[PDB]
Amino acid sequence: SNIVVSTRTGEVMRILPRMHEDINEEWISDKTRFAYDGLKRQRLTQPMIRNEKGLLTYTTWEDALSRVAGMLQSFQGNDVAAIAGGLVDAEALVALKDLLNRVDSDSLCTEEVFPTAGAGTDLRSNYLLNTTIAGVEEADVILLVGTNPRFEAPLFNARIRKSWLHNDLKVALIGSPVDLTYRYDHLGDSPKILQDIASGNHPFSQILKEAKKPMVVLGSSALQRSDGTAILAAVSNIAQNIRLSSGVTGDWKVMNILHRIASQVAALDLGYKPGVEAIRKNPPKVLFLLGADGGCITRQDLPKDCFIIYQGHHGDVGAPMADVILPGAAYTEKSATYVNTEGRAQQTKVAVTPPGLAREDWKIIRALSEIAGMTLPYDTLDQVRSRLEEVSPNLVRYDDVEGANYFQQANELSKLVNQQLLADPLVPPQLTIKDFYMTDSISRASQTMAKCVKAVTEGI
Amino acid sequence: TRPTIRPRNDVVHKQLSAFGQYVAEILPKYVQQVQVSCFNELEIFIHPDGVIPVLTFLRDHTNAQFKSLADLTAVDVPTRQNRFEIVYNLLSLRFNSRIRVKTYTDELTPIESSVTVYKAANWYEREIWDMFGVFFANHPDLRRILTDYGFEGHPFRKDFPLSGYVELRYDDEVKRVVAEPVELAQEFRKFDLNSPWEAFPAYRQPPE
Amino acid sequence: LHHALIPHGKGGRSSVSGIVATVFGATGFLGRYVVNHLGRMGSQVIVPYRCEPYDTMHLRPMGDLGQIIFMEWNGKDKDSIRKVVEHSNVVINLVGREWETKNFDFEDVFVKIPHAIAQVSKEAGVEKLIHISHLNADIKSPSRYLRSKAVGEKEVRAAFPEATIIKPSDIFGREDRFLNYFASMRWFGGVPLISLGKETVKQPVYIVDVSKGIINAIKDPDAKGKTFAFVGPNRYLLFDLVQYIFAVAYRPFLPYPLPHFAYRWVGRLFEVSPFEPWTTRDKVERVHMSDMTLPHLPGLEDLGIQATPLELKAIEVLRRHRTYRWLTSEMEDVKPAKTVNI
Amino acid sequence: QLIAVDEKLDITTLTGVPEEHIKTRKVRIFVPARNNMQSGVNNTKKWKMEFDTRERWENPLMGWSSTADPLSNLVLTFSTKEDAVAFAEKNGWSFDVEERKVPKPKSKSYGANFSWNKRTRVSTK
Amino acid sequence: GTSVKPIFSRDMNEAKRRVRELYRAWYREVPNTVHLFQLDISVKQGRDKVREMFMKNAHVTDPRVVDLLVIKGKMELEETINVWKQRTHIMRFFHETEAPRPTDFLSKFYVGHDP
Amino acid sequence: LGLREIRIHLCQRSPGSQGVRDFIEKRYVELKKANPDLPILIRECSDVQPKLWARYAFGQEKNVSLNNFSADQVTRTLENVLSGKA
Amino acid sequence: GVRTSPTGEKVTHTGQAYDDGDYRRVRFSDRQKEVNENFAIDLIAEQPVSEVGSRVISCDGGGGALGHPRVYINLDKETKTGTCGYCGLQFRQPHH
């Protein structure tokens, strides 16, 4: 969502909506509006290392960078891995990719899981919301699979409600019968139903066939479960059946994926491996936690005497388990590029500078590279964005959302794997409003969201 | 409409319109526009090449006799290709009248000095050069007048920051006054005062 | 790092440097330069003073609003020292006198006071201590000044093991007693020199270099428990140095040899002044003593300071001693002096 | 007579700006967004040119907000985007330009509040 | 013809000749400035400062900009010769008090956020 | 020697990428069948030029232009990149 | 309602007090810290609640034109008094 940060004397005062007719219209989410105070609560301000007693203690930038560089120079290849968090910018992602490549490492992963079978991340349209948000107001039917769009993407749900109200849009859901603020046809929560729709046995399959502009949306939260590849294959089968029966209506792009992580799409565009399984297969000796506060990897899943480096802006579940802490900037403290769930690249602006000794993330990575001897070829923001263009050109087009349709190739490549589905009902992580308020480090540090959760749990 | 509204004077308006037409007729080569404001002020917009002729006419013609130069100054409008606007205010004691002559220039195009027509211009032009960087050709002595010695830049330009670029302090190591990059204990607090609602419908611009 | 002490700004007057420095002897020759350099970067400077507050006026324009705090202190009172060093993370000791008063002798200003400062700073949680000694300080010198310097240096080291000790040699500057001292003896007709000053070697150092070295040692993590020697790039014979001094000042140079006992007697005669003595016996001893060479010690070049030669800075001190005839003479007109370099 | 200069306009050496504040500065050219708290649109007509935000810190005395860059409050107003771009180029500043965002024309119908069969019928007034 | 009129020079050659005249005048003036203002710098130091100030604008290709630069330099010289400037103004050209700002990436990263 | 990933940056509607487009829509799938573990990132170029990137061990990478190529030309250069032949 | 910080520093009505490790306390050495002794919150808490026999009351702070702009307070809630948004005076209807 396009926003306005209003500051005064170098302090964030409030967040307001900024009108974008194609993304958020005139509205923002409550998490967007009221979670900014979490940027003042549990902040990493100075570098930290472990002392002789095994406790985190403050340190100059020079010594922490030298320690990390010395540990990086020892190991190489598969022994060095990095996990990116949910609020990581494209510049930091590409800097970390380059830094780990100079060591000949490819274990660059994200906590959010996307299936790699078939095309995987090879084709962009495989993991994008191809119809786009504004295109929702053109569809005549939409099928939702294994998601709660109300809490995962509140403005997307608002757009769906708007089309339901004005365009008489027909909505169906496969999953838990959550309250979406509009009436929908609930088909159930068993994933097998998807296969039934593809088969044509199900009543709803005919409904998709008659529709001129059908849309199928698969939430990335359903892809987090064990049979995510099978679910994606079934959804692609449904979309391909629609395209084969009704023919090509044009540039309609039936198939969609709804993301919930701000950093996921940029990481996939840059070539990061989705999921963590690559690290669990080959545990590393040095681990970079670029704002990774999801708790997917702990010290039980790693070899003992593992050198964990955390780089972020908040003290959360990922910081106390690290050996070196490098304080980074938040999204209000840097000019950073984030890519939309529909693929639209946008850039933030600096409202205030990072507190204390905190620095920009790509600058941290570049300084570490220079200390370690493998200096990266970029010194300024323009040069690192030139590198971003070199890796993925769409990351420098800052309002473009057009892209290619490679659904045929992805569908063909998804048929070579025949993984079995699970007989486990689809349950989204967010089931009621109470689960909506705290999702990431900033909103968990926010005292306003604690009040919201308390008020929802006991109304009083 | 009587008590709180400033009264009108149509006689002066008619006289000023007639004289503006007169001046435009006599000098078609340089006069580009003539205006009379609602409070009876006559304005003449001319090409930059007509500074010396027009002013000379306005000083020496029997019907003009604008013997006094009240004020000469510049206005900075960055959105215009010709950034700077040169304004001459003249007073006629014989006919008890005031006139305004406006021309334009940019950062690199010199303006002809009007010292020969009016002696009073000598300092004003200097001030313009000091505050906006407009060069005046054939000035007897053109140099900085208001700023400090060795001052870099022209403060009255819109892109010049309010507090400037350098500040002064006494240093005891060198035993003298030194200039350093400006640093403020309290930054100037910019205020957004403009209302999001239109105030004067009469001045509304076409919406393109 | 105590967030309130995290550096902020561009290193200017209104910036925050993260340094809270108590500068003892800030109303002296070196103290003004040290306080000026500290206040340039925007440091909180605490000035303990025992003189009249008027004599501190020149130190007030050197810092931003609230960045220079003047407090009274007594050298013999440890409570005063604790009061002035309680909130500081750096303590610099520039206390010293070139003569003995009826209240303080050489072992009072160079042994007792430095030891008390070091001990109170160590027990008050001060992190960094800078102590100034002399290059020629040793316990077997004929000068009681230098013997007290050496004793106080070792006592400060004992009380504050991780202290930084800096040993300059013959600091020259506008308010010095090195160039001004030799320029002022023109009023006695001739220049008395022991053995005509042909057996003495001096290596004077610029005042700005010493202040910069102190500031750099403050912000150098590796300089915790080291000992530095601050010397100039050139070594001169005393005769050549004084001749160059008189040449820059454009005064007639009429040196003559004076025996050691006679010069010591004139120093004792001048010692009787209840005010600042023109010269003393200890001053005579230190002037005619060769500068020690300690190559094993770190120097200014190890703190990033390139020592400024006397030739580029003698005019700024000695132009005041010229007459009206020679007042406008330039710098490169005086034919730099002969150097005993290695 | 005219001399026919065929070079790019560059007044950088004449403005007296320190070279630090010419090469490392990034300006933004944009039409400001409407304040979402009011419906007035009079502040979204002209183009603005502003500079990148620099560091602000707290004064050790009184806790005021101190700055070190002179262009913190410099905002310029232009009638068209091309004028702002020309000004930035001739002043030697590197710029980023955001296209104007105009609200789409809406289709409003009062009678739609009382539809016989559509979903737009309201439940209260 | 781009409809642009000159100040003094019509091409780069005349502008270069005016630059050379101004440079000669400054080079001749430097020793008198050192003597009159009682500066603690050498004549070579002042002449190198003049050379640096002239070379700071070596990239200009517009004769009008070169003309305006020469005019400003003439005013500066006229200020210096007539002793309108003071020792402080003359010594501002050297920045003796300003601490040198490091230019490499690591030092900028250590001190703060400015590029 | 050791290839790690390859990138095809093709511009969506410019004529110079037309042949490249044909490749992606005719014989990319077969290629992905042959190299099921090699990242082959298909990305959308601006109005400038189509090109192919090849990254090797320790971060070394090189690019080749694909302007006005044909499907045969692009598969030829891709197979040259894949094998130890330039 | 001044209280003493653990370090011994007086706490202002805004609640500000330098910590033990804060060097900025050195400005109060040989001098004093200025703390206003009359706490407005405690002073306004001492005022008795005014009983009125109307649903809506008016407050101008006293003194007529020397007070604050006149405002009207609703007193329909029985579990909470009506507070003036300028003066802090409390009003309520007869209950019990």
Ligand SMILES: NC(=O)C1=CN([C@@H]2O[C@H](COP(=O)(O)OP(=O)(O)OC[C@H]3O[C@@H](n4cnc5c(N)ncnc54)[C@H](OP(=O)(O)O)[C@@H]3O)[C@@H](O)[C@H]2O)C=CC1
């Ligand atoms: N100048 C030189 O040639 C070099 C200096 N030395 C050492 O460098 C240090 C500083 O040098 P410099 O500035 O020239 O010396 P100064 O004589 O110029 O100043 C000495 C400072 O110490 C203070 N001070 C002196 N005695 C006492 C006392 N009994 N109690 C409290 N404060 C006192 C003075 O305060 P007040 O004004 O009130 O008297 C004064 O502020 C000294 O320790 C000196 O020994 C090192 C090598 C030579």
Ligand SMILES: [Zn+2]
């Ligand atoms: Zn009231």
